C-alpha cells in the first residue's frame, strides 16, 4: 500500500481489506482549515502489518507553469529476489497527451525487503466532496499510462556524467540485434552477421 500524503508518503506493506472500489477520500476538516485524507475509503481493515516506511514524496509538483510541462511522472515497479524496487522521474512535456521521443532514466528510489509475489493491482485516487449545486466527486480529469515489463538485452550508453541517453534493444528487429553485436551506436557501412536463425518443428 503506497500512500502519498500532504507530504509524508507512508509506504505500507501490510495485510489490509481492500474494498470493491478503493481510493483515497479527501475532505475538509473545518478544524485548522485543512484538507484531510480519509484513507479507509480505500481499505476497511489495517492489521497484521509486516512492514512500514516513510520517505520524501515521490509525487511532487512544481506548477506555476500554466502547462507546457504537464510534469510527466513515471514510476517503474519490479518485484524480484525479495527486493521490490521503485523507480521515478519527472519530465516536462509540451505535447497534448502522449509521450515524446526522449529517453527517461529512472533511478532506484528504495530497494525494500518485500518477499511477496504481487500478481495484480490497481491505482489509487484522491477525490473530495462538493455542496449544493445542480455529492461532489471525480475532482478534475485523470488519465495515465501502463505497460508490462519483459526480459530484454539492452545496450546502455552512459554519458561522461553517467547519464544514460541511448539504449537499444537487441531483439527489437533484425537490425537492432546486430548493433548489440558491435556494442556501438554507430554501425559502419558493411555487412555484419547477426545471430543465426532456425526453422522450428511443426
Amino acid at each position: 500500500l503506497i500512500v502519498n500524503n500532504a507530504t509524508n508518503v507512508v509506504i505500507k506493506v501490510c495485510e489490509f481489506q481492500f474494498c470493491n472500489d478503493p481510493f483515497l477520500g479527501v475532505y475538509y476538516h473545518k478544524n485548522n482549515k485543512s484538507w484531510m485524507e480519509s484513507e479507509f475509503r480505500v481499505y476497511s481493515s489495517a492489521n497484521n502489518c509486516t512492514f512500514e516506511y516513510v520517505s520524501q514524496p515521490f509525487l511532487m509538483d512544481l506548477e506555476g507553469k500554466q502547462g507546457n510541462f504537464k510534469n510527466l511522472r513515471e514510476f517503474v515497479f519490479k518485484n524480484i529476489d525479495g527486493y521490490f524496487k521503485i523507480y521515478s522521474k519527472h519530465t516536462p512535456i509540451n505535447l497534448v497527451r502522449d509521450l515524446p521521443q526522449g529517453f527517461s532514466a529512472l533511478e532506484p528510489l528504495v530497494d525494500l525487503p518485500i518477499g511477496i509475489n504481487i500478481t495484480r493491482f490497481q491505482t489509487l485516487l484522491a477525490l473530495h466532496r462538493s455542496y449544493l449545486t445542480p455529492s461532489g466527486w471525480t475532482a478534475g480529469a485523470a488519465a495515465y499510462y501502463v505497460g508490462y515489463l519483459q526480459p530484454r538485452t539492452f545496450l546502455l550508453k552512459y554519458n561522461e556524467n553517467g547519464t544514460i541517453t541511448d539504449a537499444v534493444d537487441c531483439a527489437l528487429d533484425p537490425l537492432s540485434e546486430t548493433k548489440c553485436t558491435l556494442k556501438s551506436f554507430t554501425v559502419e557501412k558493411g555487412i555484419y552477421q547477426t545471430s543465426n536463425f532456425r526453422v522450428q518443428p511443426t
Epitope: 475538509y28 476538516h29 473545518k30 482549515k33 466532496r129 455542496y131 449544493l132
Partner: antibody
Framework: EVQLLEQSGAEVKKPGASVRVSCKVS????????MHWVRQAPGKGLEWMGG????????MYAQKFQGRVTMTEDTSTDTAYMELSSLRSEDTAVYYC??????????????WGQGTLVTV | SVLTQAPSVSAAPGQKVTISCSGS????????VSWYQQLPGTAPKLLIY???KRPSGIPDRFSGSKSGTSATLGITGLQTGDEADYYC???????????FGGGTKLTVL
C-alpha cells in the same frame, strides 16, 4: 446527495428539566459541513439558533438565546448535541437541525432534520 | 422577527404574483438572501438561494431579485399545491447571526 438522521426523536420533558438534541447525518461526515439550529413555534415563524460560523471558525450561539443552549460534536459518530436548559413558557417548540456549507459564504440551511418539538 | 413581510396573501390559480421582503442595508444590503417553504406540520424547504439560484428539484418558474434593501421572491405559474408560507432570510452582521421574517402564508384562490 445526502439525507440526514433525525434531530432528536420525540422528546417530552415536563417543566423542571432540560434536553439535549443529537442530530446525525448520512452520506457525509460530520466535520466536513456545519450544522445550524432554528426555533420554530407552531403557528409562528422562524427563530434562528445555535449554528456554526464559517468565518472565525467558531460555533455560533444566538445572542438572544446565548448561554442557555450549548453544542458539542462527536466527529466519528456524527452526533451533535444541542442542550437547551432552564425551561420557560414559550420555549417549547420545533427546533430544526440545519446545515450550511463551510465553502463558503452560504447562508442557506440546506437539507435539514424534519423537526422535533420539545416540552416545557 | 426583525424583517418585514405580511402574514398572508391570496391570488387566483395559474396566475403570476410574487412576494417581497423588506430588509435594511445592515441585513439584506451586503448579504445574500434565501427563501424557504413549509407545508403544515412539515419540513421547511429551501426555495431560492442568493435569489438567483435554484436548488435541485425546484421548478424554474421561480425567480428572485434584490433592489436595495428590498428582496422579491419571484412566484409564477401558481398551482393548487402552492399554498404555504414563504420565509425570507439573509445573513445579519448586526447581531452577527441568522435572521428571518415572520413569514407569509400564500393562498391560491
Amino acid at each position: 446527495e445526502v439525507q440526514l438522521l433525525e434531530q432528536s426523536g420525540a422528546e417530552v420533558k415536563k417543566p423542571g428539566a432540560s434536553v439535549r438534541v443529537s442530530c446525525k447525518v448520512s452520506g457525509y461526515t460530520l466535520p466536513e459541513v456545519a450544522m445550524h439550529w432554528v426555533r420554530q413555534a407552531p403557528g409562528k415563524g422562524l427563530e434562528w439558533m445555535g449554528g456554526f460560523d464559517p468565518e472565525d471558525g467558531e460555533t455560533m450561539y444566538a445572542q438572544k438565546f446565548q448561554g442557555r443552549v450549548t453544542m458539542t460534536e462527536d466527529t466519528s459518530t456524527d452526533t451533535a448535541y444541542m442542550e437547551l436548559s432552564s425551561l420557560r413558557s414559550e420555549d417549547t417548540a420545533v427546533y430544526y437541525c440545519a446545515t450550511t456549507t463551510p465553502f463558503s459564504s452560504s447562508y442557506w440551511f440546506d437539507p435539514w432534520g424534519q423537526g422535533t418539538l420539545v416540552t416545557v | 422577527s426583525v424583517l418585514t413581510q405580511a402574514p398572508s396573501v391570496s391570488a387566483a390559480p395559474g396566475q403570476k404574483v410574487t412576494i417581497s421582503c423588506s430588509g435594511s442595508s445592515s441585513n439584506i444590503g451586503n448579504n445574500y438572501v434565501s427563501w424557504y417553504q413549509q407545508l403544515p406540520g412539515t419540513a421547511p424547504k429551501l426555495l431560492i438561494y442568493d435569489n438567483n439560484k435554484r436548488p435541485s428539484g425546484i421548478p424554474d418558474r421561480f425567480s428572485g431579485s434584490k433592489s436595495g434593501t428590498s428582496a422579491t421572491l419571484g412566484i409564477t405559474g401558481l398551482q393548487t399545491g402552492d399554498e404555504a408560507d414563504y420565509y425570507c432570510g439573509t445573513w445579519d452582521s448586526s447581531l452577527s447571526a441568522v435572521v428571518f421574517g415572520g413569514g407569509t402564508k400564500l393562498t391560491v384562490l
